[PDB]
Design an enzyme around this catalytic site. Structure first.
Site, PDB file in Angstrom:
ATOM      1  N   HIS A  84       0.980  -1.136  -0.038  1.00  0.00           N
ATOM      2  CA  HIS A  84       0.044   0.071  -0.036  1.00  0.00           C
ATOM      3  C   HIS A  84       0.874   1.185  -0.080  1.00  0.00           C
ATOM      4  CE1 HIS A  84       0.254   0.306   4.506  1.00  0.00           C
ATOM      5  NE2 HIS A  84       0.088   1.395   4.533  1.00  0.00           N
ATOM      6  N   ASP A 116       0.472  -7.615   1.587  1.00  0.00           N
ATOM      7  CA  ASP A 116       0.676  -6.173   1.848  1.00  0.00           C
ATOM      8  C   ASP A 116       2.048  -6.004   1.862  1.00  0.00           C
ATOM      9  OD1 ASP A 116       0.797  -3.570   1.928  1.00  0.00           O
ATOM     10  OD2 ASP A 116      -0.150  -3.461   3.805  1.00  0.00           O
ATOM     11  N   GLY A 155       2.401   6.872   8.660  1.00  0.00           N
ATOM     12  CA  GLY A 155       3.754   7.339   8.388  1.00  0.00           C
ATOM     13  C   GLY A 155       4.695   6.233   8.646  1.00  0.00           C
TER      14      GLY A 155
HETATM   15  N1  LIG Z   1      -2.547   1.993  14.066  1.00  0.00           N
HETATM   16  C1  LIG Z   1      -1.420   1.274  13.406  1.00  0.00           C
HETATM   17  N2  LIG Z   1      -0.799   0.079  13.889  1.00  0.00           N
HETATM   18  C2  LIG Z   1      -1.387   1.943  12.119  1.00  0.00           C
HETATM   19  C3  LIG Z   1      -0.203   1.420  11.295  1.00  0.00           C
HETATM   20  C4  LIG Z   1       0.220   1.819  10.017  1.00  0.00           C
HETATM   21  C5  LIG Z   1      -0.611   2.854   9.699  1.00  0.00           C
HETATM   22  N3  LIG Z   1      -0.725   3.399   8.438  1.00  0.00           N
HETATM   23  C6  LIG Z   1      -1.560   4.121   8.172  1.00  0.00           C
HETATM   24  C7  LIG Z   1      -1.915   4.686   7.223  1.00  0.00           C
HETATM   25  C8  LIG Z   1      -3.140   5.748   6.993  1.00  0.00           C
HETATM   26  C9  LIG Z   1      -3.457   6.250   5.743  1.00  0.00           C
HETATM   27  C10 LIG Z   1      -2.566   6.251   4.618  1.00  0.00           C
HETATM   28  C11 LIG Z   1      -1.731   5.271   4.752  1.00  0.00           C
HETATM   29  C12 LIG Z   1      -1.358   4.579   5.830  1.00  0.00           C
HETATM   30  O1  LIG Z   1      -0.150   3.607   5.933  1.00  0.00           O
HETATM   31  N4  LIG Z   1      -2.757   3.952   9.299  1.00  0.00           N
HETATM   32  C13 LIG Z   1      -1.740   3.197  10.007  1.00  0.00           C
HETATM   33  C14 LIG Z   1      -2.202   2.720  11.425  1.00  0.00           C
END
Ligand SMILES: NC(=[NH2+])c1ccc2[nH]c(-c3ccccc3O)nc2c1
Ligand SMILES: [Ca+2]
Length: 223
Positions: A40, A84, A175
């Site tokens: 992604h 992913d 991020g």
């Molecule tokens: N809570 C978590 N462990 C988490 C981890 C990675 C994420 N990556 C993202 C994300 C949000 C919007 C666009 C791309 C993303 O990878 N949310 C995320 C939430």
């Protein structure tokens, strides 16, 4: 990373920042010409930044190399995030040293209870955005499959595992996607998704790398 600490410059030598004019995802260096990240995080125009600590300042040890190709797993499903994982070949090989080093792929999957190190420049707030300049670290345990499936019913596949704290307060966040989950010196997970960040009963979900080692090896071998 929410509830984590400052890693210390170059203490995580395999961590890379994927940059397209700004940091958008993390990745892991597995050899001098290949990086593993999340499917992604794919986009064109990716510059891989190695030896980074403060992503907004050049301080020395940084190596910026453009991606030659990005290979998203052929069975990646963007609606479930199953498979992913993505491989990025670098235009030229990185110079490895103690600040830029590759991490090893696992030989076996890890068990629940195993403590791992998750790192990244993602959001440090669960409500609001606060992106840090330096790399943050978090130690988190792999959770049992029953607690993971009870937390995300119907959304976990066998290529995913949960790691984190059900009480909330510590987790990876936006991020951090694409970055490493290292346990006992082996790359066991890739930051993939979660519901919000550091919320109670909603642990982080990670790509289970041990299920892709043969694909990674066959794909690098043929490219
Ligand atoms: N809570 C978590 N462990 C988490 C981890 C990675 C994420 N990556 C993202 C994300 C949000 C919007 C666009 C791309 C993303 O990878 N949310 C995320 C939430
Ligand atoms: Ca820097």
């Amino acid at each position: 990373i929410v509830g984590g600490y400052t890693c210390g410059a170059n203490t995580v030598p395999y961590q890379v920042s994927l940059n397209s004019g700004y940091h958008f995802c993390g990745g892991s260096l597995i050899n001098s010409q290949w990086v593993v990240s999340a499917a992604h995080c794919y986009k064109s125009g990716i510059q891989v930044r190695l030896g980074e600590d403060n992503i907004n300042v050049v301080e020395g040890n940084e190596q910026f190399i453009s991606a030659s190709k990005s290979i998203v797993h052929p069975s990646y499903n963007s609606n479930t995030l199953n498979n992913d994982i993505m491989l990025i070949k670098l235009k030229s090989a990185a110079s490895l040293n103690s600040r830029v080093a590759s991490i090893s792929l696992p030989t076996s999957c890890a068990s629940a209870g195993t403590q791992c190190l998750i790192s990244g420049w993602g959001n440090t707030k669960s409500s609001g955005t606060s992106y840090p300049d330096v790399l943050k670290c978090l130690k988190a345990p792999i959770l049992s499959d029953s607690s993971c499936k009870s937390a995300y019913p119907g959304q976990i596949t066998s290529n995913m595992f949960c790691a984190g704290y059900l009480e909330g307060g510590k987790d990876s966040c936006q991020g951090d996607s694409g970055g490493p989950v290292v346990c006992s010196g082996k790359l066991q997970g890739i930051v993939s998704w979660g519901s919000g960040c550091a919320q109670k009963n909603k642990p982080g979900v990670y790509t289970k790398v041990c299920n892709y080692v043969s694909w990674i090896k066959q794909t690098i071998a043929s490219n």
